[PDB]
Write a structure and sequence with these properties.
Chain B: Keywords: Ribonucleoprotein, Ribosomal protein, RNA-binding, rRNA-binding. Chain B: It holds the Pfam family Ribosomal_S6. Chain B: One of its GO terms (molecular function) is structural constituent of ribosome. The structure is cut from a larger assembly and holds chains A, B, C and D. In chain A, about 75% of the residues lie in helices and about 0% in strands. By secondary structure, chain A is mainly alpha-helical. Chain B contains two helices and five strands, in the order E-H-E-E-E-H-E. The chains are: A mainly alpha, B alpha+beta, C mainly alpha, D alpha/beta. Chains B and C meet through strand 2 and strand 5 of B and helix 3 of C. Bound molecules: potassium ion (K) (12 copies) and magnesium ion (36 copies). One magnesium ion binds near residues 17 and 46 of chain D.
Chain lengths: ~90, ~100, ~70, ~120
RNA sequence: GUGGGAGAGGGUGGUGGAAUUCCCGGAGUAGCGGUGAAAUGCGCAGAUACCGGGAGGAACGCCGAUGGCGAAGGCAGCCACCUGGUCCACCCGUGACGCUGAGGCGCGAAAGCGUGGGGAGCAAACCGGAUUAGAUACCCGGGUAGUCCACGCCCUAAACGAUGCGCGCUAGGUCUCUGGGUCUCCUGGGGGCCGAAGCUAACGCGUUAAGCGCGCCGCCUGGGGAGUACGGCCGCAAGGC
């Protein structure tokens, strides 16, 4: 799973400022954590299709946000991608 | 780290000596995996509801240990190796759900 | 009609999650080692559900029965 | 000859025949009977009457070994299942106690097409 | 975000008891089985019925519900691990980041296909017994593929609520699952029943709409010929679109 600390860590590591919990960046980070943790799970259990539905949803939820960010502040965008190491 | 309960039913015909060797191996293993005995309840033997391993009784052991999840299955598999160990029932500890209280 | 006294009423405080109290668990099994209905256990769905779980645990341990022989007749 | 005086009486009822097996306190058979063991050959074996005779027949065959009292075990739900009980009671043999112990699975094998459907 | 919750949601490993079958031992003897009645069949190389031991496969009694979970298919012993969804409370953070969704991609009961394994019980085909005017059937005795596992295909269905998805609006009553609260009851999410307004050809629907509205997709246009022919795409094939 993902413990409070782990969770809390990344949040802080990404909050746009102290107290920032629900910013686009925080979200994308958090999401990336899940997507990755889940992605590894699937490499093992390739048959757990149900969980894979979830994967699909997150990957999408992420696209949505990133797309939003990049349309509002193309900079913070490139920044966030760079940090999170996303895109292609 | 998570809190579990290693239930163990042993051969009801072990002499004070035999009971001890098996009971220590139990202690031995618990360590090799990452357990930490918080408490034990050697309730001893009781009359089984059905014959287990051809005996109408079993010697019961209980522990409220704490260990690393990714090992719980492995440890349990180990305890089972013994022939005097006829039951290994490990359970994630829970908050007592009272009722009619 | 499931009359008589309910198993819950006829009892005090207990931990539905304690799969080792044979004295009390044993009360929720019928003459046969079958798990009694809500009509009889006098429990709430949520409770009844937890019970079944612990009872099944007690059986595997040997503490409780899986089935008993019907007597009389 | 062997003298037992007390043992078990197993009644195996079914919708096609009744069959009584009397054994020692360890389950080893001493004598047995059935619808066919008596005259009956076709469907008259599942008849409660058949049961009665079959049961009575076993009781006598048992008396011979000194048998005096017995524990009954009932398996099956055929007709004349309750008749074999009744019979044994009035058979000189003292019926210490009845007990239904019909096997039932906790769902193992797919039944024959003839025995399929639930709820 | 934080704190709580219920659940047969999924995947992996392990494990428990009941029952069937087979094998070993005991005891025991003449039938058992099966049907409307029978017969085939099995049994003195000793069956059936009974007790003890063992092997193996498949499925999980009671709990169990009118219940729960899932997007659908679908999901039920128990334990651990890995993992998806979801509801509630607090109003804490971002600040319209939303809805729908041609094509695409993925999932997709059963049967079926390939390779390997397994095989208790059941069972297309098939081999027999009966029934019948006949009986390529129903009933009975057998029994192969298959049913089960791994990996890869197939992509269909009365895949059904025969009801696409989201949002707002329009009386209530009653049972129920799950959560919060000052806990008769109030408030939220889900499952049912009856019903205001209204709708409907009618049956019925009726805050879980088939009502009143807006957004987007899919689809229809008399019956037969025909889900056929042709073409294309897909599949090892069967065959699918
Ligand atoms: K014969
Ligand atoms: K249901
Ligand atoms: K969860
Ligand atoms: K084949
Ligand atoms: K399957
Ligand atoms: K497939
Ligand atoms: K409450
Ligand atoms: K009307
Ligand atoms: K109607
Ligand atoms: K074609
Ligand atoms: K082709
Ligand atoms: K096809
Ligand atoms: Mg008969
Ligand atoms: Mg939470
Ligand atoms: Mg589940
Ligand atoms: Mg068995
Ligand atoms: Mg034998
Ligand atoms: Mg012959
Ligand atoms: Mg002979
Ligand atoms: Mg032979
Ligand atoms: Mg047999
Ligand atoms: Mg046996
Ligand atoms: Mg075998
Ligand atoms: Mg639903
Ligand atoms: Mg989770
Ligand atoms: Mg706020
Ligand atoms: Mg602001
Ligand atoms: Mg969409
Ligand atoms: Mg399929
Ligand atoms: Mg299949
Ligand atoms: Mg195959
Ligand atoms: Mg094969
Ligand atoms: Mg068959
Ligand atoms: Mg003919
Ligand atoms: Mg047949
Ligand atoms: Mg339907
Ligand atoms: Mg209502
Ligand atoms: Mg409601
Ligand atoms: Mg409600
Ligand atoms: Mg429902
Ligand atoms: Mg009206
Ligand atoms: Mg209505
Ligand atoms: Mg609406
Ligand atoms: Mg069309
Ligand atoms: Mg036409
Ligand atoms: Mg025309
Ligand atoms: Mg047509
Ligand atoms: Mg077609």
């Amino acid at each position: 799973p993902i413990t409070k600390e782990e969770k809390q860590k990344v949040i802080q590591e990404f909050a746009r400022f102290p107290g920032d919990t629900g910013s686009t960046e925080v979200q994308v980070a958090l999401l990336t954590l899940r997507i990755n943790r889940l992605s590894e799970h699937l490499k093992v259990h390739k048959k757990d299709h149900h969980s894979h539905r979830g994967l699909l949803m997150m990957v999408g939820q992420r696209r949505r946000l990133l797309r939003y960010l990049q349309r509002e502040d193309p900079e913070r965008y490139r920044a966030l991608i760079e940090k999170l190491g996303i895109r292609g | 780290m998570r809190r579990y309960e290693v239930n163990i039913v042993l051969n009801p015909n072990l002499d004070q000596s035999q009971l001890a060797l098996e009971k220590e191996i139990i202690q031995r293993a618990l360590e090799n995996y990452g357990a930490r005995v918080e408490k034990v309840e050697e309730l001893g033997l009781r009359r089984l509801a059905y014959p287990i391993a051809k005996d109408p009784q079993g010697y019961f052991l209980w522990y409220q240990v704490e260990m690393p999840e990714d090992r719980v299955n492995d440890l349990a598999r180990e305890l089972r190796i013994r022939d005097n160990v006829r039951r290994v029932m490990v359970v994630k500890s829970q908050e007592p759900f009272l009722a009619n209280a | 009609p499931s009359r008589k006294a309910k198993v819950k009423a006829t009892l005090g405080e207990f931990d539905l999650r304690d799969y080792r109290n044979v004295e009390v668990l044993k009360r929720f099994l019928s003459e046969t080692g079958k798990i009694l209905p809500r009509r009889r256990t006098g429990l709430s769905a949520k409770e009844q559900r937890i019970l079944a779980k612990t009872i099944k645990r007690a059986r595997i341990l040997g503490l409780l029965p899986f089935t008993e022989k019907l007597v009389r007749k | 000859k062997r003298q037992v005086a007390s043992g078990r009486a197993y009644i195996h009822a079914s919708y096609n025949n009744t069959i009584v097996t009397i054994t020692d306190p360890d389950g080893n058979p001493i004598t047995w009977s059935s619808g066919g063991v008596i005259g009956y050959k076709g469907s008259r074996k599942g008849t409660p009457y058949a049961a009665q005779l079959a049961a009575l027949d076993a009781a006598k065959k048992a008396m011979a070994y000194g048998m005096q009292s017995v524990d009954v075990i009932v398996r099956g739900t055929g007709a004349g299942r309750e008749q074999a009980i009744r019979a044994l009671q009035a058979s000189g043999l003292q019926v210490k106690s009845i007990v239904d112990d019909t096997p039932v699975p906790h769902n193992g094998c797919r039944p024959k097409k003839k025995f399929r459907k639930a709820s």
